[PDB]
Structures are given as C-alpha cells and as structure tokens.
C-alpha cells in the first residue's frame, strides 16, 4: 500500500473464553535465497550412498515454507499448564495465518566490506497448496518450526521432497514438481498475505489418565456366576485326572470373565538406564524392533502406543518406544544422556500392555495323556474384537497434526507420534524471494512478521472424584534460574517435556 | 448399486517411509550408541539427531499394512527346490477341520523392486497369465517377506538382545494399505457375507464389496 505504512500489527496473547481457547502467535522471520534460485536433484549418491536402508531420491527447491506444527508454537508454558490441568480434551477448530511487514534487504559486498540496503521494488512470492497437490512434509516432525519464545527470530526451512527410488536411481514412476507451475501472490514492501483454514472434525485428544485398570473393572464384593476350571488332577499320582470347577470370585480375580481386553502390542527391547545392567554389545540397531517395506528395514519408532514400563519401575525404557527430545545446546551426534529428554508414556499402562513385555500366552498344542500342555509367548498381537487402547500422548514440544495418507483403507488413522490425524490438514505455505537480475543474480534476502491464530475447542472436567487430582506444578525451591525462562546470556530453554495427562477418568 | 468407495486406479509417487523432507533434521533423537568401544565393560548410552543422513531411525506417523506370508516361487525352475511343495508348503487357513488355501489373501506386493521373476505361490490371480501387484509396495509389505522384527526377551549383562521374525501381522493402529487392483478379466463386485462383523469388507480377489449386490 505504501513504503512508510506498516502492513500489520503485533498480535500475541491467549484469551480464554468459555469452552474455547484462542491462541495468537507472532514472530519474526528471515528467508534467504536457497540453491541460488535453482531447482536441483538430490540423492544419496551425492552423500555416497552408503546404506540401502538410507537410500533416497528427491529434489531441493528454492522455495521455503512456514511451519507451526509443534505445540509450543501456539502455547506458552502457562497456557499449556492452564490447558492440561483443567481439561479432559481439546482439538483445533479454526486457523488464521497472516504474513506482513515485508522487507527486502540487498547485500552489497564491495572489496570485502559489506553494506545492507533496501531494495524497494523487489517481490516475495507466496502461495498455499489447498488442493494438496504437492508432497506433504509437515508430518515428519521436522525442525525449522516457529520458536517457542516470542522474542526469537527464526530462519525459514528449505522445501524439498522425495519420490520413488531404486538405490540412488530414479524410476519411470517417479514424479518431479516445479512450484513455479502454481499460481502465486507477489508482495512488495507494502503488500501483505493471509488466509483462513477450517479444520475438519476430529476426535478430542484425551488428556487424562484412567483411574482404573482393564483387569480390575469388576465389583470386588460379589462372586461371578461364571465358572472356571480349578483342578485338573485330584492329587499327585497315576490316573488322577479330574474336572473340578470353582466360582469366579474376588479371592481369585485373574480367572474371572471379562468383556474387553487390552490393546495391540509390538514388543520393544528394554534398555536399562544403569549402563552396567545392559548387555556389553552394540544392540541399538541390531536389537531394534523394525518393519520392512520394499526390501528396506525401517525402525519401529515410536510405533504403537504402549506403556513404557511397569508400575514401580523408573530405570527402564523401550529402545525405540518413546519420543526423545534434545535439550537446548545439545549436539547433533552422539550426545550424552543428560542432554536428551526421553518422554514417558506410563499413563496409558492401565489399558495398554507394557511395550517391553509379551502380550500374553497361547496354547501351541493339544494336551493329552501322552503330552503335557504347552504355551508360548505372544511377542506381537494385532487387533482383536474386544480390544480398547489409548493413543500416544501429545507434548508441548511434540507435533500437533499429521496428514492421513491417501490409501484404499486404514485403521485408526491417529498418527503414531501423537496428535490429530487429518485427511485435509492445514495447507503448506510456500514462500520464496523473486530472483532479481541467466546464472548471475543479486545477493538478496527478505524478512518480516508472521502471526498465526488457532481456535481450540475444550472438553471440561465433569469428574466426581472426591480426593484431589495430580496437577502439573512448578516446583518451589531456590535455583539459579526459573524453568521455562531465559538465562543470563539470553538463551530460552525448556527443561522438561510436559505431557497432557494429569486429570483422571473412569474406565 | 449401493454407495461404494471409488476404486483407486493410481500408483503412489512416494513410499510410506520416504515422506520426510530430505533437507531438514528432525527434533527427535534416537539411541545411536550402546557401547563406547571394544573391550570389557564398555557400556554407554549416546543419542544422535535423526535426520537426512540416517533415515531409517526417524520417527514416523504411519506404518505399512498387514501381511500373511506367501512362499516365494521363481519363474526359473532350477532355482526352485526339487520337491513337491504346492500343498505341503502352502499358506492356508483352517475352518472346521478343513484346510483351505489362502488364495489370494491379503493384498501385498508380489515382489520386491528389481526381482521380476519371483512371485507368491498362491498370492496372485492366474487367468496362463500371472498378475503382479507391483504398485502396492509403497504402502504394503512384500508378500514373500516377514513383516519385520520384534524383541523376544529382556537384554541384560548375561543375555544379548534377541529378536524374532514376524511372519503374519494383523491390523495395528496407524496402518495403511492398498487393495488389490481390479483387472479387465477380473471380477467387478462381490457379496459381503452376512455376519455380526467384518473388517474392510472389500473382497480379496478384487473389486467392490456390497451388502446388497446385483
């Protein structure tokens, strides 16, 4: 509109009204030119193509995208505490994304000294894919998202994708995409960009922990009318076989009939925190649970939602069972245990089997006079009629939504890293700098503001529980810093992952 | 005709495990290193960023469809075993004491990329013309392969980490699959059996499931 007229204001806050929460987040961004305005093929052959499991083929693009998939983008540590303590459920309703205050800086480097001046006639192309025609990279829990802390300025990640491959080669079915082939919106220093998105109806995330267990649903005061075989033999000796039945009752609760059974399981290897209790060998990949696709083994990470450990155990965790977050300052390769944050999914232990335990036992033969009864362990159990299970929990750090893949059929589309499965998720937002003059261009970058607004719908806590619930609290003791704040150097760190499950319900 | 879902007649230009952005790291870490090095008592826990370099350890939101393994048969006879295994080695399901061959069974990839000759024993329709479900490999496991691995024990100082193969795997939450491709010589519709319950009523020989067909 004008060179000296701002194209938008700063909106950050979280107003809570009724059963809905509106969160507004504004940041500052910088978008460099990627690949010198070139689309370039990429494959592991550039990196040497060491492994077959690591093989990939795809393309890098000059475009950049805006990502707000992680939960901490939209929630402060206070807003997240206000959410998880007071509610049994939540889910996104509406989305509003504004892009404004465009500034194009030209870098002038003359004889080793560099001066940065404005380019007022430059444009910045932006578009969204609302037909879901491009590959969707927002569901892989990638880096480059909006910062948790409102005063941080973030760099936009570079958009690239992958397609079919054999080794590092392509195949006749592989696809190539030119994002220039979409209609886009051009922005000079006074222009702005916005769009609104409507989430499709999803089930409320269950931010609660059961106060009962699946094997303890029965009234403990009354005997069942069902019967179970108690004794197969009268006494030790020859020809002592007999059939004797007993009432299923509170004295023996393991044999009582039940209408429902715990959810599916795919076992993980359990790693002990005390290093001397672990096996003295390298088993991170060898002893890992994995699945195969097109002749390539992929690790089962995180996989099906299962309890991390049995109650009363604090020193064991599944090898690939839970999401692991790095603390700030943590290095890219082989960092120590203190640097990382391994999440715990012990809340779901009541309805789900433990990740590191067998589902149960089955008979593998017919008992007879000649042969004794034999059972064997179920390492993995698929869906059975009568099963119930809890989805994996969502974290302040972790991802929000995923795109349900497009297939003939799926079961329980909820994503395995947590969050809301959607066949039409929030659309990708693609942005780039317009090349300004052919391989010779002008050194150029752009910057501005990004505001995002999501309306959340809440499910209130109706519980009749008499005693007080567990709540997420800030511990009170003296320390050199307060948690979830900046230190003396200006670095804002998040000390721990905050789960969503504190309040309880009946099973 | 009652309402049926549109039959998919397209092949994915991506694979389930490559959905990632190749240029960017994940914020998730994995356990890279359990031992500092060779020698006695060299035990440690070290974590690395999951990213473009190592793509098989990254976190994933979805996993491939179910599998019930078919025995593999090579079109070159000399590579096959010199024995009669058509029935003795068949994948089958038992009903009321009678063993029925699992023909065709769950939709899976007929063969891995680069192995045109091999095909599942009973896994394909045969009109002889043996059809192969090459397209479904992106979201489906291969017919002749194990679904994956699971741990069979608790590793400790005394015992090494032990795995075991998954030959059949039922539905899990988070799975996706492609049905069997319909053919010009193949069937159109089938009658869904009248039962208390069923899952994914689509018929296994291909085509549309209907409770009230023609």
């Amino acid at each position: 509109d004008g060179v000296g007229s701002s194209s938008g204001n700063w909106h950050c806050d979280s107003q809570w009204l009724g059963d809905r929460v509106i969160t507004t987040s504004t940041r500052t961004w910088a978008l460099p030119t990627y690949n010198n305005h070139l689309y370039k093929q990429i494959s592991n052959s550039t990196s040497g193509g060491s492994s077959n499991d690591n093989a990939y083929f795809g393309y890098s693009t000059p475009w950049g995208y805006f990502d707000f998939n992680r939960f901490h983008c939209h929630f402060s540590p206070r807003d997240w505490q206000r959410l998880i303590n007071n509610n049994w459920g939540f889910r996104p309703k509406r989305l509003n994304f504004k892009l404004f205050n465009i500034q194009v800086k030209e870098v002038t480097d003359n004889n080793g000294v560099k001066t940065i001046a404005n380019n007022l006639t430059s444009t910045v192309q932006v578009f969204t894919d609302s037909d879901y025609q491009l590959p969707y990279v927002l569901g892989s829990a990638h880096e480059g998202c909006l910062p948790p802390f409102p005063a941080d300025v973030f760099m936009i990640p570079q958009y690239g994708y992958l397609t079919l491959n054999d080794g590092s080669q392509a195949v006749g079915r592989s696809s190539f995409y030119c994002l220039e082939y979409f209609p886009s919106q051009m922005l000079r220093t006074g222009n702005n960009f916005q769009f609104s998105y409507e989430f499709e109806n999803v089930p409320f995330h269950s931010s609660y922990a059961h106060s009962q267990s699946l094997d303890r649903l029965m009234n403990p005061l009354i005997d069942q009318y069902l019967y179970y075989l108690s004794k197969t033999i009268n006494g030790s000796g020859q020809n002592q076989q007999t059939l004797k039945f007993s009432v299923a009752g509170p004295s023996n609760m393991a044999v009582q009939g039940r209408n429902y059974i715990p959810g599916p399981s795919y076992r993980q290897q359990r790693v002990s925190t005390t290093v001397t209790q672990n096996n003295n060998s390298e088993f991170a990949w060898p002893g890992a649970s994995s699945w195969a696709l097109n002749g390539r083994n992929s690790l089962m990470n995180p996989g099906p939602a299962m309890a991390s450990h049995k109650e009363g155990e604090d020193r064991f965790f599944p090898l690939s069972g839970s999401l692991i977050f790095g603390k700030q300052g943590t290095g890219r390769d082989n960092v120590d245990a203190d640097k990382v944050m391994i999440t715990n999914e012990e809340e779901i232990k009541t309805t789900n089997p433990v990740a590191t335990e067998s589902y149960g036992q089955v008979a593998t033969n017919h008992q007879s006079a000649q042969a004794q009864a034999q059972t064997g362990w179920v390492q993995n159990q698929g869906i059975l009629p009568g099963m119930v299970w809890q989805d994996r929990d969502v974290y302040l750090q972790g991802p929000i939504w995923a795109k349900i893949p497009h297939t003939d059929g799926n079961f329980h589309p909820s994503p395995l890293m947590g969050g809301f499965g959607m066949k039409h998720p929030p659309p990708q937002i693609l942005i780039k700098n317009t090349p300004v003059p052919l391989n010779s261009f002008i050194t150029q970058y752009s910057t501005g503001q990004v505001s995002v607004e999501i309306e959340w719908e809440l499910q209130k806590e109706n519980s009749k529980r008499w005693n007080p619930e567990i709540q997420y609290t800030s511990n009170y003791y003296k320390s050199n810093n307060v948690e979830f704040a900046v230190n003396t150097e200006g670095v804002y760190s998040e000390p721990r992952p905050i789960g969503t499950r504190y309040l309880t319900r009946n099973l | 005709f009652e309402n049926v879902p549109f039959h998919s007649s397209y092949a994915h230009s991506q694979s389930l495990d490559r959905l990632m952005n190749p240029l960017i790291d994940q914020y998730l870490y994995y356990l890279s290193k359990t031992i500092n090095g060779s020698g006695q008592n060299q035990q440690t826990l070290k974590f690395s960023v999951a990213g473009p370099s190592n793509m098989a350890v990254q976190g994933r939101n979805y996993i491939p469809g179910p599998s019930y393994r078919q025995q593999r048969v090579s079109t070159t006879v000399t590579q096959n075993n010199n024995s009669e295994f058509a029935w003795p080695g068949a994948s089958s399901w038992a009903l009321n004491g009678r063993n029925s061959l699992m023909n065709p069974g769950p939709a899976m990839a007929s063969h891995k990329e680069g192995e045109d000759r091999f095909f599942p024993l009973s896994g394909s329709l045969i009109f002889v013309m043996i059809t192969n479900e090459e397209e479904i490999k992106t979201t489906n496991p291969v017919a002749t392969e194990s679904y994956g691995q699971v741990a069979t024990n608790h590793q400790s100082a005394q015992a090494q980490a032990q795995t075991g193969w998954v030959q059949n795997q039922g539905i899990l939450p988070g799975m996706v699959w492609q049905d069997r491709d319909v053919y010009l010589q193949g069937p159109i519709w089938a009658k869904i059996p009248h039962t208390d319950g069923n899952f994914h009523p689509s018929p296994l020989m291909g085509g549309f499931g209907m409770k009230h067909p023609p």
Partner: antibody
Amino acid sequence: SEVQLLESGGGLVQPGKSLRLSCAASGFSFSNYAMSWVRQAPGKGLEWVSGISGSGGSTNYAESVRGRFTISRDNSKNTLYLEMNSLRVEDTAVYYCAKGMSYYDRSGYFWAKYHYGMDVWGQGITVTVSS
Amino acid sequence: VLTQPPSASGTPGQRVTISCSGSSSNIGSNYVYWYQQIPGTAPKLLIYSNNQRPSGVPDRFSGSKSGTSASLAISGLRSEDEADYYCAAWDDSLSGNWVFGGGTKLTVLG
C-alpha cells in the same frame, strides 16, 4: 538451611546382630530425589554404601555391604530407612543420610549417574559393632 | 577408587591445587563433585558438575576436569579453608557406585 535430614537408630550392636537406621527428611519434596547412605569409619575417608531412587523402584549398593544391607524409603512418611543384617566389627562408622541434589519426576526416568550427587547431608549417627 | 594426595599445604593468600586421578569409568565419563569436610561435621558441597558451584560458596573455590583427572584449585587461601577434601564421581563399573576419593587434608602454614 531449609533442607533438614535426621538420623535415628544408631547404637552399639554385637556382631551378627542386625539394626535399622532411619532418616527423617523435611524442607523439600522427598519422593523427587534419590537418597543415599554414606558411612565414615573413624579416621577414614567417606564411603558410599547405598542409594535409592525417588520412587524407590531402583536401589544400588556397594559391594562390601551388598546382601547384608537393604535400603528402603517410605515416601508417605518422608523417611529413608537402612536395614543392616549380619553386622560385623568392620561396620563401625558414622553413617550419614545424604540427599540427592538433582530433581526429577515421572515424566523423565531415574538416572543413577545424575541423581546420586548429594548437595546436603545429615549430622550422622555413630554405629558401633563390638563384642 | 579415586586417588588423592594425602595432604596439601599452603600459605594464606596463595593458590593451592588438590587433584584426583581416576579411571575411564568414573572421572572420565562422569561428573566430578567436591566435598569439604571439617572433622566432627557433616560434609559440605563445594563443586558439582565438574566446574559448577552451589550458592553460599565463595568465588575462590574453582574445579575443573580434564581427561580422567580432576583438579580443585583454591585461591586466596585462608585459615578457615583448612580441612579435608573429598573427591567424588559416579562409577559405571562394578555394578554402579558413587565413589569418594581417599581424602586430602589441606594445612594452612604460618
């Protein structure tokens, strides 16, 4: 000095006999730190005997005291308990109750490396094993 | 175990260094803690997490770790700084133990 640890149950015990030590903790959240017992023999350096996790699920012991001693804690009563069996003259020492400085919870896991560091100690109770 | 010199000596206002030698399992891969104890009293924490120090501890006490050895340096030594020093670190080997050094008795001469 907000944090306070007390020890009771110290005394003179003949060899072979077993006695129980208790520590009363106050001024901090007890179940969120892993406690430990450290013993100092007269005219000798400090020696760590055993430590327990905040939940109480995992416990560690020094080789010398292993199998004779057992460490337990009652989180409801904020008490660290050390039960010693088959005592011997070698056990005469001043036993201390040391609180684990690092704070952790159910969201994370117990890490013996990080959580055994002890910021505050206790006065200690002398224990004598003589005939 | 962690090895420490039995005694160390200093003059007031002069820097003194106390060091503990350790194996790969303890000093090499784990944080080292320093405890100051005066006889007839429960120990006090001086340095934790290699170079960090708790509040209420004077600036002069500095601790560092290189390789398998950790050194505690005292500057502006005082009469009240004379006590026994214990070096501690977690030991991965032999089932996991917290190990204290043998102790060092710092004497302020003069």
